[PDB]
Design a protein around this ligand. Structure first.
Ligand code: MG
Ligand code: MG
Lengths: 193, 187
């Protein structure tokens, strides 16, 4: 497990700071809970501090660029961390499915193995959170999201297949696959009613 | 290394929410950065989920009890996690040295080994943060705290020695000792 170095402490502080008034969609839980969960998941599978730092700051440029920009990111953590975070950026397309399609194509060919790993921890924590919220809110939960039940099932299963083809059976892929099969039992439970 | 279970995810969310308007002394960094750092340090030394959960929520009752109280804590995470967090309660004394003295006496005899471990991760992250700020701001930083340089050196070295006598050597103890020697070389 990586030690909490001054550079890793600085990244924890920066992620909490940049996302200080950022809250997760659907509730009042501060967004940093997701960023540290992603870092914690990555810590179990990598010893590369740049990967833990890019996991902490992967959403800064897309969600809070007014608080923390790419020049700030590079001056604080170097160009490899900036490159890592910038590989996960979306194509500026109107359509959700056109953005998802391009991200998936990049993940299968183009994205580095480190960017695929960060993306796997990110999607795994997002699916873990959806599963938690399904137990609380049921089938009514899909309203707070930009893509419905069948689009979500497609998204997570495609991310899982691509992640498994690129990285193999690591701890994040063993867990993401388990989550995908749980999401399918929840769609089965919805239809069973 | 513990898996991110639904109960551990709930504790991460609860710690971030309860401390959403809580900031670390001296700046604008949200306090959850410290709570998460303490949990991360504990994860390297324990597989007891109650200890990781008490590390995440150790400051809720003392710093933000209006957001999260002991009944909420027990209903969400059980009475063992509540007991763990309540062992790390600092007595309400007007003197800093009277508050420190009582905490140290409890840590050496009374506190459970799990509470001693949480306290070690907490003090280690606090000293890591002070050392980081000393490299940035220099000697003028000693004015910022409620206890001066010599009182801080006493505090961290006493916590380190008590922690060693109770737990033996562990990764947290070791790192805390390294931090205490850094604090001394800069004096
Ligand atoms: Mg994310
Ligand atoms: Mg503390």
């Amino acid at each position: 497990m990586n030690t909490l170095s001054p550079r890793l402490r600085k990244a924890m502080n920066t992620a909490a700071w940049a996302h200080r008034h950022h809250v997760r969609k659907g509730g009042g839980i501060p967004y940093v809970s997701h960023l540290y969960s992603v870092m914690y998941l990555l810590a179990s599978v990598t010893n590369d501090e740049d990967v833990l730092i890019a996991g902490l700051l992967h959403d800064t440029l897309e969600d809070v660029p007014e608080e923390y920009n790419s020049a700030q990111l590079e001056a604080d953590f170097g160009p490899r961390v900036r490159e890592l975070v910038e590989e996960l950026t979306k194509q500026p397309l109107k359509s959700w499915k056109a953005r998802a399609d391009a991200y998936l194509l990049h993940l299968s060919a183009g994205a580095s193995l480190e960017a695929v790993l960060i993306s796997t921890a990110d999607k795994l924590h997002n699916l873990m959170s959806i599963l938690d919220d399904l137990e609380i809110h049921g089938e009514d939960l899909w309203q707070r999201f930009n893509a419905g039940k069948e689009q979500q099932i497609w998204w997570y299963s495609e991310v899982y297949q691509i992640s498994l083809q690129r990285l193999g059976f690591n701890e994040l892929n063993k867990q993401l696959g388990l989550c995908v099969e749980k999401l399918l039992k929840q769609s089965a439970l919805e239809h069973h009613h």
